[PDB]
Ligand binder design. Sequence first.
Ligand code: NA
Ligand code: NA
Lengths: 238, 236
Amino acid sequence: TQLSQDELKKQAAWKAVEYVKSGMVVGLGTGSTAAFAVDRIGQLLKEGKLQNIVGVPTSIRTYEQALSLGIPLATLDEQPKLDVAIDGADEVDPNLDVVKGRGGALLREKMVEMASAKFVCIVDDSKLVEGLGGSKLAMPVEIVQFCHKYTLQRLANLPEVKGCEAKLRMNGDKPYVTDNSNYIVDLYFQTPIKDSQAASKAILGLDGVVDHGLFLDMVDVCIIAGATGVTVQERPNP
Amino acid sequence: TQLSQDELKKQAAWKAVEYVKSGMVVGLGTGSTAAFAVDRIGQLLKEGKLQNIVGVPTSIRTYEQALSLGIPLATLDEQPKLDVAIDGADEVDPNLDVVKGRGGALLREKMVEMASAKFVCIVDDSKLVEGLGGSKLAMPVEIVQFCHKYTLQRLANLPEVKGCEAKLRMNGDKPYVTDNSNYIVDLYFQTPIKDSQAASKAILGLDGVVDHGLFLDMVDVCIIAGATGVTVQERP
Ligand code: NA
Ligand code: NA
Protein backbone atom coordinates (compact mmCIF):
# COMPACT_ATOMS: atom_id res chain seq x y z
CA THR A 1 0.00 0.00 0.00
CA GLN A 2 2.67 2.56 0.96
CA LEU A 3 5.36 0.74 -1.08
CA SER A 4 5.38 1.66 -4.75
CA GLN A 5 6.15 -0.89 -7.44
CA ASP A 6 9.62 0.63 -7.88
CA GLU A 7 10.29 0.41 -4.13
CA LEU A 8 9.28 -3.28 -4.15
CA LYS A 9 11.52 -3.97 -7.16
CA LYS A 10 14.46 -2.38 -5.37
CA GLN A 11 13.82 -4.39 -2.19
CA ALA A 12 13.85 -7.63 -4.17
CA ALA A 13 16.99 -6.56 -6.00
CA TRP A 14 18.95 -5.80 -2.85
CA LYS A 15 18.01 -9.14 -1.29
CA ALA A 16 19.21 -10.91 -4.45
CA VAL A 17 22.59 -9.20 -4.43
CA GLU A 18 23.29 -11.02 -1.15
CA TYR A 19 23.86 -14.12 -3.29
CA VAL A 20 26.78 -12.31 -5.03
CA LYS A 21 30.14 -13.01 -3.40
CA SER A 22 33.56 -11.58 -4.15
CA GLY A 23 35.27 -13.48 -6.92
CA MET A 24 32.14 -14.40 -8.84
CA VAL A 25 31.25 -14.17 -12.49
CA VAL A 26 27.73 -12.69 -12.40
CA GLY A 27 25.05 -12.68 -15.05
CA LEU A 28 23.49 -9.21 -15.15
CA GLY A 29 19.83 -9.17 -16.10
CA THR A 30 17.78 -6.62 -18.01
CA GLY A 31 14.85 -4.40 -17.20
CA SER A 32 13.80 -2.07 -14.44
CA THR A 33 13.98 -4.64 -11.63
CA ALA A 34 17.37 -5.96 -12.69
CA ALA A 35 18.67 -2.41 -13.03
CA PHE A 36 18.31 -2.00 -9.26
CA ALA A 37 20.48 -5.09 -8.76
CA VAL A 38 23.11 -3.83 -11.21
CA ASP A 39 23.22 -0.51 -9.36
CA ARG A 40 23.53 -2.30 -6.00
CA ILE A 41 26.42 -4.43 -7.26
CA GLY A 42 28.10 -1.32 -8.61
CA GLN A 43 27.62 0.48 -5.27
CA LEU A 44 29.05 -2.42 -3.27
CA LEU A 45 32.08 -2.63 -5.56
CA LYS A 46 32.71 1.12 -5.17
CA GLU A 47 32.43 0.70 -1.39
CA GLY A 48 34.82 -2.28 -1.32
CA LYS A 49 32.20 -4.64 0.11
CA LEU A 50 32.51 -6.68 -3.09
CA GLN A 51 35.75 -7.37 -4.94
CA ASN A 52 36.88 -9.33 -7.99
CA ILE A 53 33.52 -9.35 -9.76
CA VAL A 54 33.08 -9.77 -13.50
CA GLY A 55 29.64 -9.15 -14.99
CA VAL A 56 28.20 -10.67 -18.15
CA PRO A 57 25.42 -8.35 -19.43
CA THR A 58 22.26 -9.61 -21.11
CA SER A 59 21.38 -6.47 -23.10
CA ILE A 60 22.81 -3.25 -24.51
CA ARG A 61 21.01 -1.31 -21.77
CA THR A 62 22.65 -3.49 -19.08
CA TYR A 63 26.06 -3.20 -20.72
CA GLU A 64 25.76 0.58 -20.73
CA GLN A 65 24.54 0.72 -17.14
CA ALA A 66 27.22 -1.59 -15.78
CA LEU A 67 29.94 0.22 -17.77
CA SER A 68 28.79 3.55 -16.27
CA LEU A 69 29.15 2.03 -12.77
CA GLY A 70 32.64 0.67 -13.41
CA ILE A 71 31.68 -2.99 -13.14
CA PRO A 72 34.23 -5.11 -15.09
CA LEU A 73 32.47 -6.79 -17.98
CA ALA A 74 32.89 -9.87 -20.17
CA THR A 75 30.92 -11.88 -22.72
CA LEU A 76 29.84 -15.52 -22.60
CA ASP A 77 32.62 -16.26 -25.11
CA GLU A 78 35.10 -15.10 -22.45
CA GLN A 79 33.26 -16.38 -19.35
CA PRO A 80 31.08 -19.35 -20.39
CA LYS A 81 30.31 -20.40 -16.80
CA LEU A 82 28.69 -17.99 -14.37
CA ASP A 83 28.31 -18.43 -10.63
CA VAL A 84 25.12 -16.40 -10.16
CA ALA A 85 22.72 -14.64 -12.50
CA ILE A 86 20.23 -12.02 -11.30
CA ASP A 87 17.34 -11.08 -13.59
CA GLY A 88 13.69 -10.11 -13.54
CA ALA A 89 10.79 -11.91 -15.08
CA ASP A 90 7.62 -10.97 -16.90
CA GLU A 91 5.60 -13.75 -15.23
CA VAL A 92 6.37 -16.27 -12.45
CA ASP A 93 4.23 -19.37 -11.98
CA PRO A 94 4.01 -21.59 -8.84
CA ASN A 95 6.82 -23.81 -10.12
CA LEU A 96 9.15 -20.85 -10.64
CA ASP A 97 8.84 -21.33 -14.37
CA VAL A 98 8.85 -17.86 -15.90
CA VAL A 99 8.08 -15.89 -19.04
CA LYS A 100 10.99 -13.67 -20.03
CA GLY A 101 12.18 -11.55 -22.89
CA ARG A 102 9.00 -9.59 -23.38
CA GLY A 103 10.90 -6.29 -23.40
CA GLY A 104 13.76 -7.57 -25.53
CA ALA A 105 17.00 -9.48 -25.00
CA LEU A 106 15.19 -12.85 -24.95
CA LEU A 107 17.93 -15.09 -26.38
CA ARG A 108 20.79 -13.34 -24.61
CA GLU A 109 19.03 -13.68 -21.26
CA LYS A 110 18.31 -17.36 -21.94
CA MET A 111 21.89 -18.14 -23.00
CA VAL A 112 23.43 -16.27 -20.07
CA GLU A 113 21.06 -17.78 -17.50
CA MET A 114 21.47 -21.30 -18.86
CA ALA A 115 25.20 -20.82 -18.23
CA SER A 116 24.64 -19.83 -14.59
CA ALA A 117 24.98 -22.21 -11.66
CA LYS A 118 22.39 -20.27 -9.65
CA PHE A 119 19.68 -18.13 -11.28
CA VAL A 120 18.07 -15.73 -8.81
CA CYS A 121 14.92 -14.16 -10.23
CA ILE A 122 13.70 -10.88 -8.77
CA VAL A 123 10.10 -9.65 -9.00
CA ASP A 124 7.51 -7.49 -7.35
CA ASP A 125 4.40 -9.55 -6.61
CA SER A 126 2.46 -8.21 -9.63
CA LYS A 127 4.49 -10.67 -11.72
CA LEU A 128 2.97 -13.75 -10.10
CA VAL A 129 0.62 -15.69 -12.38
CA GLU A 130 -1.56 -18.76 -12.02
CA GLY A 131 0.14 -20.20 -15.08
CA LEU A 132 2.34 -19.05 -17.93
CA GLY A 133 0.51 -16.72 -20.27
CA GLY A 134 -1.82 -15.76 -17.46
CA SER A 135 -0.82 -12.09 -17.44
CA LYS A 136 -2.62 -11.82 -20.84
CA LEU A 137 0.48 -9.91 -22.02
CA ALA A 138 2.96 -10.94 -24.70
CA MET A 139 4.73 -14.30 -24.59
CA PRO A 140 7.50 -13.82 -27.20
CA VAL A 141 8.71 -16.26 -29.85
CA GLU A 142 11.84 -15.40 -31.83
CA ILE A 143 11.51 -16.51 -35.45
CA VAL A 144 13.44 -16.36 -38.70
CA GLN A 145 12.41 -13.66 -41.14
CA PHE A 146 11.72 -16.04 -44.05
CA CYS A 147 7.97 -16.69 -44.41
CA HIS A 148 7.19 -15.06 -41.09
CA LYS A 149 3.44 -14.95 -41.88
CA TYR A 150 3.44 -18.72 -42.37
CA THR A 151 5.36 -19.26 -39.12
CA LEU A 152 2.99 -16.97 -37.19
CA GLN A 153 -0.02 -18.98 -38.36
CA ARG A 154 1.84 -22.25 -37.63
CA LEU A 155 2.49 -21.03 -34.06
CA ALA A 156 -1.07 -19.91 -33.43
CA ASN A 157 -2.32 -23.33 -34.51
CA LEU A 158 0.00 -25.52 -32.45
CA PRO A 159 -2.21 -27.68 -30.18
CA GLU A 160 -0.02 -26.87 -27.17
CA VAL A 161 -0.91 -23.18 -27.35
CA LYS A 162 -4.43 -23.64 -28.68
CA GLY A 163 -6.51 -20.56 -28.03
CA CYS A 164 -3.79 -17.95 -28.23
CA GLU A 165 -3.63 -14.91 -30.48
CA ALA A 166 -0.39 -14.23 -32.34
CA LYS A 167 0.97 -10.90 -33.59
CA LEU A 168 4.16 -9.96 -35.36
CA ARG A 169 5.96 -7.40 -33.23
CA MET A 170 6.39 -4.07 -35.02
CA ASN A 171 8.83 -1.21 -34.43
CA GLY A 172 6.67 1.41 -36.10
CA ASP A 173 6.62 0.88 -39.86
CA LYS A 174 9.15 -1.99 -39.79
CA PRO A 175 8.96 -5.33 -37.94
CA TYR A 176 10.97 -5.38 -34.73
CA VAL A 177 14.38 -7.06 -35.06
CA THR A 178 16.28 -8.82 -32.30
CA ASP A 179 20.04 -8.79 -31.58
CA ASN A 180 20.32 -11.68 -34.06
CA SER A 181 18.27 -10.06 -36.83
CA ASN A 182 15.24 -12.22 -36.14
CA TYR A 183 11.59 -11.26 -35.78
CA ILE A 184 9.33 -11.73 -32.75
CA VAL A 185 5.85 -13.21 -32.79
CA ASP A 186 4.08 -12.33 -29.56
CA LEU A 187 1.56 -14.89 -28.31
CA TYR A 188 -1.29 -13.66 -26.13
CA PHE A 189 -3.32 -15.94 -23.89
CA GLN A 190 -6.62 -15.60 -22.08
CA THR A 191 -6.11 -18.78 -20.07
CA PRO A 192 -2.68 -20.13 -19.10
CA ILE A 193 -0.69 -22.59 -21.16
CA LYS A 194 -1.77 -25.97 -19.85
CA ASP A 195 1.50 -27.89 -20.35
CA SER A 196 4.42 -25.49 -20.50
CA GLN A 197 7.05 -28.17 -21.21
CA ALA A 198 4.98 -29.53 -24.11
CA ALA A 199 4.50 -25.99 -25.43
CA SER A 200 8.22 -25.26 -25.22
CA LYS A 201 9.15 -28.43 -27.09
CA ALA A 202 6.47 -27.90 -29.74
CA ILE A 203 7.50 -24.28 -30.36
CA LEU A 204 11.18 -25.16 -30.58
CA GLY A 205 10.33 -28.07 -32.85
CA LEU A 206 8.73 -25.78 -35.42
CA ASP A 207 11.18 -25.22 -38.28
CA GLY A 208 11.41 -21.40 -38.45
CA VAL A 209 11.49 -20.80 -34.69
CA VAL A 210 14.72 -19.73 -33.05
CA ASP A 211 13.69 -19.59 -29.39
CA HIS A 212 10.95 -18.38 -27.06
CA GLY A 213 10.16 -16.76 -23.75
CA LEU A 214 9.26 -19.85 -21.71
CA PHE A 215 12.19 -20.20 -19.29
CA LEU A 216 11.48 -23.56 -17.71
CA ASP A 217 13.38 -25.34 -14.95
CA MET A 218 15.88 -22.47 -14.82
CA VAL A 219 15.13 -20.28 -11.81
CA ASP A 220 16.67 -21.65 -8.62
CA VAL A 221 15.50 -18.92 -6.20
CA CYS A 222 12.79 -16.31 -6.67
CA ILE A 223 12.76 -13.19 -4.54
CA ILE A 224 9.26 -11.73 -4.42
CA ALA A 225 8.60 -8.31 -2.91
CA GLY A 226 5.05 -7.38 -1.98
CA ALA A 227 3.13 -5.24 0.45
CA THR A 228 3.65 -7.82 3.21
CA GLY A 229 7.43 -8.00 2.79
CA VAL A 230 10.02 -9.93 0.83
CA THR A 231 9.73 -13.70 0.34
CA VAL A 232 12.64 -15.88 -0.73
CA GLN A 233 11.15 -18.84 -2.61
CA GLU A 234 13.50 -21.70 -3.28
CA ARG A 235 12.35 -23.72 -6.25
CA PRO A 236 9.55 -26.03 -5.07
CA ASN A 237 9.72 -29.77 -5.51
CA PRO A 238 13.53 -30.12 -5.90
CA THR B 1 30.98 -47.15 -65.40
CA GLN B 2 30.19 -44.85 -68.34
CA LEU B 3 27.72 -42.68 -66.40
CA SER B 4 29.26 -39.74 -64.55
CA GLN B 5 27.93 -38.50 -61.23
CA ASP B 6 26.35 -35.52 -62.99
CA GLU B 7 24.63 -37.83 -65.49
CA LEU B 8 23.27 -39.95 -62.64
CA LYS B 9 22.00 -36.86 -60.84
CA LYS B 10 20.12 -35.75 -63.96
CA GLN B 11 18.60 -39.21 -64.40
CA ALA B 12 17.27 -39.15 -60.83
CA ALA B 13 16.00 -35.59 -61.31
CA TRP B 14 14.08 -36.38 -64.48
CA LYS B 15 12.45 -39.41 -62.86
CA ALA B 16 11.39 -37.26 -59.90
CA VAL B 17 9.74 -34.64 -62.11
CA GLU B 18 7.28 -37.33 -63.23
CA TYR B 19 5.63 -36.84 -59.82
CA VAL B 20 4.87 -33.23 -60.80
CA LYS B 21 1.40 -32.90 -62.33
CA SER B 22 -0.22 -29.84 -63.85
CA GLY B 23 -1.94 -27.82 -61.17
CA MET B 24 0.53 -28.46 -58.40
CA VAL B 25 2.42 -26.28 -55.96
CA VAL B 26 5.97 -27.63 -56.03
CA GLY B 27 8.83 -27.20 -53.58
CA LEU B 28 12.04 -26.56 -55.49
CA GLY B 29 15.21 -27.90 -53.89
CA THR B 30 18.79 -26.64 -53.75
CA GLY B 31 22.03 -28.11 -55.02
CA SER B 32 23.37 -29.66 -58.19
CA THR B 33 20.95 -32.61 -58.17
CA ALA B 34 17.88 -30.50 -57.50
CA ALA B 35 19.00 -27.97 -60.11
CA PHE B 36 18.49 -30.57 -62.84
CA ALA B 37 14.92 -31.06 -61.61
CA VAL B 38 14.27 -27.31 -61.54
CA ASP B 39 15.62 -27.04 -65.10
CA ARG B 40 13.39 -29.93 -66.24
CA ILE B 41 10.26 -28.40 -64.69
CA GLY B 42 11.06 -25.15 -66.45
CA GLN B 43 11.57 -26.94 -69.76
CA LEU B 44 8.29 -28.86 -69.50
CA LEU B 45 6.43 -25.62 -68.73
CA LYS B 46 7.97 -23.84 -71.73
CA GLU B 47 6.97 -26.80 -73.91
CA GLY B 48 3.39 -26.88 -72.61
CA LYS B 49 3.87 -30.38 -71.14
CA LEU B 50 3.07 -28.92 -67.70
CA GLN B 51 0.66 -26.12 -66.86
CA ASN B 52 -0.55 -24.30 -63.78
CA ILE B 53 2.56 -24.90 -61.68
CA VAL B 54 3.71 -22.63 -58.88
CA GLY B 55 7.20 -23.17 -57.47
CA VAL B 56 8.36 -22.49 -53.94
CA PRO B 57 12.15 -22.09 -53.72
CA THR B 58 14.28 -23.45 -50.88
CA SER B 59 17.15 -20.98 -51.40
CA ILE B 60 17.99 -17.63 -52.93
CA ARG B 61 20.05 -19.62 -55.47
CA THR B 62 17.03 -21.69 -56.53
CA TYR B 63 14.82 -18.60 -56.60
CA GLU B 64 17.27 -17.10 -59.07
CA GLN B 65 17.36 -20.27 -61.17
CA ALA B 66 13.58 -20.55 -61.34
CA LEU B 67 13.33 -16.82 -62.12
CA SER B 68 15.60 -17.36 -65.12
CA LEU B 69 13.39 -20.22 -66.35
CA GLY B 70 10.07 -18.37 -66.03
CA ILE B 71 8.57 -20.71 -63.44
CA PRO B 72 5.80 -18.87 -61.53
CA LEU B 73 6.98 -18.52 -57.95
CA ALA B 74 5.51 -18.06 -54.51
CA THR B 75 6.42 -18.62 -50.86
CA LEU B 76 4.81 -20.50 -47.97
CA ASP B 77 3.15 -17.19 -46.98
CA GLU B 78 0.98 -17.51 -50.11
CA GLN B 79 1.04 -21.31 -50.59
CA PRO B 80 1.35 -22.96 -47.16
CA LYS B 81 0.48 -26.41 -48.54
CA LEU B 82 2.63 -27.98 -51.26
CA ASP B 83 1.76 -31.03 -53.29
CA VAL B 84 5.29 -32.24 -54.08
CA ALA B 85 8.78 -31.13 -53.09
CA ILE B 86 11.86 -32.34 -54.95
CA ASP B 87 15.27 -31.99 -53.29
CA GLY B 88 18.63 -33.70 -52.89
CA ALA B 89 20.31 -35.09 -49.80
CA ASP B 90 23.82 -35.42 -48.45
CA GLU B 91 23.17 -38.80 -46.78
CA VAL B 92 20.19 -41.23 -47.10
CA ASP B 93 19.87 -44.04 -44.45
CA PRO B 94 17.80 -47.33 -44.79
CA ASN B 95 14.55 -45.69 -43.47
CA LEU B 96 14.90 -42.57 -45.78
CA ASP B 97 16.00 -40.32 -42.93
CA VAL B 98 18.52 -37.91 -44.42
CA VAL B 99 21.23 -35.38 -43.70
CA LYS B 100 21.00 -32.14 -45.64
CA GLY B 101 22.54 -28.68 -45.68
CA ARG B 102 26.08 -29.15 -46.99
CA GLY B 103 25.03 -26.39 -49.56
CA GLY B 104 23.90 -24.10 -46.74
CA ALA B 105 20.11 -24.18 -47.27
CA LEU B 106 18.94 -26.61 -44.57
CA LEU B 107 16.51 -24.17 -42.88
CA ARG B 108 14.38 -23.14 -45.84
CA GLU B 109 14.58 -26.66 -47.24
CA LYS B 110 13.17 -27.99 -43.98
CA MET B 111 10.36 -25.42 -43.83
CA VAL B 112 9.35 -25.99 -47.45
CA GLU B 113 9.60 -29.78 -47.34
CA MET B 114 7.70 -30.01 -44.03
CA ALA B 115 4.82 -28.29 -45.83
CA SER B 116 4.83 -30.77 -48.72
CA ALA B 117 2.42 -33.69 -49.00
CA LYS B 118 5.01 -35.73 -50.92
CA PHE B 119 8.75 -35.12 -50.50
CA VAL B 120 10.68 -36.82 -53.28
CA CYS B 121 14.42 -37.03 -52.56
CA ILE B 122 16.79 -37.43 -55.51
CA VAL B 123 20.31 -38.78 -55.19
CA ASP B 124 23.02 -40.61 -56.96
CA ASP B 125 23.95 -43.75 -55.10
CA SER B 126 27.07 -42.26 -53.46
CA LYS B 127 24.71 -40.64 -50.94
CA LEU B 128 23.46 -43.90 -49.38
CA VAL B 129 24.62 -44.62 -45.84
CA GLU B 130 23.90 -47.36 -43.34
CA GLY B 131 23.56 -44.78 -40.60
CA LEU B 132 23.29 -40.99 -40.45
CA GLY B 133 26.64 -39.39 -39.77
CA GLY B 134 28.25 -42.40 -41.39
CA SER B 135 29.58 -40.52 -44.41
CA LYS B 136 32.11 -38.88 -42.01
CA LEU B 137 31.20 -35.57 -43.70
CA ALA B 138 29.43 -32.54 -42.35
CA MET B 139 26.22 -32.77 -40.35
CA PRO B 140 25.26 -29.08 -40.38
CA VAL B 141 23.72 -27.02 -37.59
CA GLU B 142 22.51 -23.47 -38.24
CA ILE B 143 23.26 -21.19 -35.27
CA VAL B 144 22.80 -17.58 -34.35
CA GLN B 145 25.85 -15.35 -34.66
CA PHE B 146 25.82 -14.10 -31.07
CA CYS B 147 28.53 -15.84 -29.02
CA HIS B 148 28.91 -18.46 -31.75
CA LYS B 149 32.22 -19.63 -30.29
CA TYR B 150 30.35 -20.49 -27.09
CA THR B 151 27.54 -22.24 -28.98
CA LEU B 152 30.00 -24.35 -31.00
CA GLN B 153 31.59 -25.71 -27.76
CA ARG B 154 28.13 -26.43 -26.20
CA LEU B 155 27.13 -28.23 -29.47
CA ALA B 156 30.27 -30.38 -29.46
CA ASN B 157 29.63 -31.47 -25.87
CA LEU B 158 25.98 -32.56 -26.09
CA PRO B 159 25.68 -36.19 -24.92
CA GLU B 160 23.99 -37.18 -28.20
CA VAL B 161 26.94 -36.11 -30.37
CA LYS B 162 29.80 -35.87 -27.90
CA GLY B 163 32.81 -37.36 -29.67
CA CYS B 164 32.31 -35.49 -32.93
CA GLU B 165 34.49 -32.70 -34.27
CA ALA B 166 32.74 -29.33 -34.64
CA LYS B 167 33.83 -26.58 -37.03
CA LEU B 168 32.40 -23.21 -37.89
CA ARG B 169 31.78 -23.31 -41.63
CA MET B 170 34.06 -20.91 -43.51
CA ASN B 171 33.86 -19.15 -46.85
CA GLY B 172 37.57 -18.65 -47.28
CA ASP B 173 38.86 -16.60 -44.35
CA LYS B 174 35.39 -15.43 -43.29
CA PRO B 175 32.54 -17.40 -41.77
CA TYR B 176 29.88 -18.72 -44.14
CA VAL B 177 26.59 -16.80 -43.90
CA THR B 178 23.33 -18.54 -44.67
CA ASP B 179 20.40 -17.07 -46.61
CA ASN B 180 18.98 -16.26 -43.12
CA SER B 181 22.04 -14.31 -41.92
CA ASN B 182 23.16 -17.11 -39.57
CA TYR B 183 26.36 -19.18 -39.21
CA ILE B 184 26.72 -22.98 -39.56
CA VAL B 185 28.59 -25.33 -37.26
CA ASP B 186 29.37 -28.56 -39.12
CA LEU B 187 29.59 -31.68 -36.95
CA TYR B 188 31.82 -34.52 -38.14
CA PHE B 189 31.45 -38.09 -36.89
CA GLN B 190 33.70 -41.11 -37.20
CA THR B 191 30.77 -43.54 -36.73
CA PRO B 192 27.03 -43.00 -37.15
CA ILE B 193 25.00 -40.95 -34.59
CA LYS B 194 23.77 -43.26 -31.76
CA ASP B 195 20.12 -41.99 -31.93
CA SER B 196 19.23 -39.45 -34.59
CA GLN B 197 15.91 -38.53 -32.98
CA ALA B 198 17.66 -37.91 -29.66
CA ALA B 199 20.40 -35.93 -31.41
CA SER B 200 17.74 -33.84 -33.15
CA LYS B 201 15.98 -33.07 -29.88
CA ALA B 202 19.16 -32.16 -28.04
CA ILE B 203 20.50 -29.95 -30.80
CA LEU B 204 17.16 -28.15 -31.15
CA GLY B 205 17.00 -27.78 -27.40
CA LEU B 206 20.26 -25.84 -27.28
CA ASP B 207 19.59 -22.11 -27.00
CA GLY B 208 21.53 -20.52 -29.84
CA VAL B 209 20.59 -23.16 -32.38
CA VAL B 210 18.26 -22.26 -35.20
CA ASP B 211 17.89 -25.66 -36.88
CA HIS B 212 19.93 -28.59 -38.15
CA GLY B 213 20.50 -30.97 -41.05
CA LEU B 214 18.77 -34.08 -39.64
CA PHE B 215 15.62 -34.47 -41.76
CA LEU B 216 13.78 -37.28 -40.01
CA ASP B 217 10.47 -38.88 -40.98
CA MET B 218 10.17 -36.49 -43.96
CA VAL B 219 11.18 -38.15 -47.20
CA ASP B 220 8.32 -40.11 -48.79
CA VAL B 221 10.06 -41.40 -51.91
CA CYS B 222 13.76 -41.58 -52.72
CA ILE B 223 14.91 -41.87 -56.33
CA ILE B 224 18.41 -43.34 -56.56
CA ALA B 225 20.48 -43.28 -59.75
CA GLY B 226 23.44 -45.66 -60.00
CA ALA B 227 25.45 -47.50 -62.63
CA THR B 228 22.77 -50.20 -62.74
CA GLY B 229 19.91 -47.81 -63.40
CA VAL B 230 17.35 -45.77 -61.45
CA THR B 231 15.63 -47.23 -58.37
CA VAL B 232 12.56 -45.91 -56.54
CA GLN B 233 12.36 -46.54 -52.78
CA GLU B 234 9.26 -45.62 -50.79
CA ARG B 235 9.41 -45.02 -47.06
CA PRO B 236 9.49 -48.42 -45.23
NA1 NA C 1 -4.47 -23.91 -60.74
NA1 NA D 1 21.82 -27.49 -48.84
